[PDB]
Amino acid sequence: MVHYYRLSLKSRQKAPKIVNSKYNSILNIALKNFRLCKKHKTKKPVQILALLQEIIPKSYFGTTTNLKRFYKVVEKILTQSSFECIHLSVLHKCYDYDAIPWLQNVEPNLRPKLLLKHNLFLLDNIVKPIIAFYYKPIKTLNGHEIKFIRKEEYISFESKVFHKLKKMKYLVEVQDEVKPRGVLNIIPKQDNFRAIVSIFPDSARKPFFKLLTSKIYKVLEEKYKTSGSLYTCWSEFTQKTQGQIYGIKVDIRDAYGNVKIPVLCKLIQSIPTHLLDSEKKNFIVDHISNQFVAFRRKIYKWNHGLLQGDPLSGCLCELYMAFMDRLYFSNLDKDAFIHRTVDDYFFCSPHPHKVYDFELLIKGVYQVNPTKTRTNLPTHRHPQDEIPYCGKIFNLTTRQVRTLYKLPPNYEIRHKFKLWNFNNQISDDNPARFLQKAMDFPFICNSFTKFEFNTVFNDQRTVFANFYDAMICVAYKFDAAMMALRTSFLVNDFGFIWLVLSSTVRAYASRAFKKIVTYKGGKYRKVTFQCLKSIAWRAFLAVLKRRTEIYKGLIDRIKSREKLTMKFHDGEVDASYFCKLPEKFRFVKINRKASI
């Protein structure tokens, strides 16, 4: 049942001194070389590819061609996404066996098994450990993007934050060890940091926290008013408002960290006895006051509110923020639009003066980031007409809502997708299953919602813009899968591709159509299946064109076989939007290349 090898450094093993009977002595050299390399200190930057080619002797591969096949794998590891694997077969298929010296004393038929066994050793014992020796893998959280940071630079950074947390008050040591219940970890954030904790695991059993936190969500949804659906809120607000809407988004700085510990305590116990009472009274209380964590052989106390990582912090923060909502947000025009999350508040009104008051009020209540604040008030130096909130872009004048796409400069789009599932592995001879699975719906879940396809507040042309943007992603995923088919599945005959592409276009056009009909409103004019199909195809062209070499025949096929021209029903449409890669998608990296 095992076709995959994982690329994660986590699978790495502690290299022995020498190999046993099972392996060829050739490996002992590479192990010596790995030891030598680590012992050597240079003021000159390390390239792993180059280093390995000194560590693993060429005689292990026999020929340049064999060596290059192995280092494609190493190059993938060096550029990996979370969860990514390759096929185990790539570690033996296509190798020049007659040219590998140490395999010459072994009959052809059982050579591939040995190479597999030996390649795996080098990968697990040398390739992965060398990377983790010089680099610290960091999950950037922007999709499955792994960033490799120089281990020396990380420790430098990690200490700078440690000495600062200590200097302030957030971290205070307590004498003895052997009572952590959690290990503190500093995570590099863009321009900043984030202090989280790992479990152990098996603290008190999570069935104990899960049924515990479940009763707390009840307390929130019973004793506090329901905020309601974001969609319903925006729908009802825009329809009753006829004048120029004004609005503000405010980002809350460290909502977890700026929790008043003593105040939340009073609340937890104050909740009705028939919901928690004595049983879990002090249980939660002391757990918030006694935040015990381990670091570098020492144990520290956390007193900066709820620590991110605790399986209860999430719900307790929600419970806390709800309380501060009643406490300090009591005025507020009830006709106004108000929506908030764990981190964000979003407030709108046709009366501009109530927006100013909200900005001033919010800053009195919470700690915010005026850098991450978005508003249309003619007061600010840079009044934004479109404010982003919960993965959507709200335009206050037009009332249109588009999906927000989060793609930094030089972001490698393949990091956004999960093509490999270790608990559901696909064999190397089944590329069609892999491509089809890749085109399944669940991944672009949040581009195919009420927000995108409604014609209540959204114009028909907005819906098309949303659908087109969504299909650009599907297409980028299709391209990422296509790259995996040639490099892991090692496909030669790509004939099956065309029908999978055609079905995908159909399927997505069909879902678009259904969603449009479901959420039909007064702004609807006429949407045909044919038109959506054309928009979908255009989005595939836009992405495909980035590799006019590899996708040459496929592009011609689309252009000669498919309807690419559509009729619009809004003279206000921007038809040019459908001609090309939208500028938010036009600069994402689609070429993999080792950088460390």
Automatic annotation (TrEMBL):
GO function terms (MF aspect): DNA binding; metal ion binding; telomerase activity
GO CC annotations on file: chromosome, telomeric region; nucleus
Chain sites annotated for binding Mg(2+) 1: D251, I252, D343
Enzyme superclass (EC): transferase
All residue ranges annotated as the Reverse transcriptase domain in the record: 168-394
Binding-site positions, Mg(2+) 3: D251, D343, D344
EC annotation from Swiss-Prot or TrEMBL: 2.7.7.49
InterPro entries: DNA/RNA_pol_sf, RT_dom, Telomerase_RBD, Telomerase_RT, TERT_thumb
Reaction(s) the record says it catalyses: DNA(n) + a 2'-deoxyribonucleoside 5'-triphosphate = DNA(n+1) + diphosphate
Gene3D superfamilies assigned to the protein according to its UniProt record, in alphabetical order: 1.10.10.2210, 1.10.132.70, 1.10.357.90, 3.10.10.20, 3.30.70.2630
Positions that bind dGTP: K189, R194, D254, A255, Y256, N369, K372
Subcellular localization: Nucleus; Chromosome, Telomere
Entry keywords, A to Z: Calcium, Chromosome, Magnesium, Metal-binding, Nucleotidyltransferase, Nucleus, RNA-directed DNA polymerase, Telomere, Transferase
The protein's name in its UniProt record: Telomerase reverse transcriptase
UniProt lineage: Eukaryota, Metazoa, Ecdysozoa, Arthropoda, Hexapoda
Gene: TERT
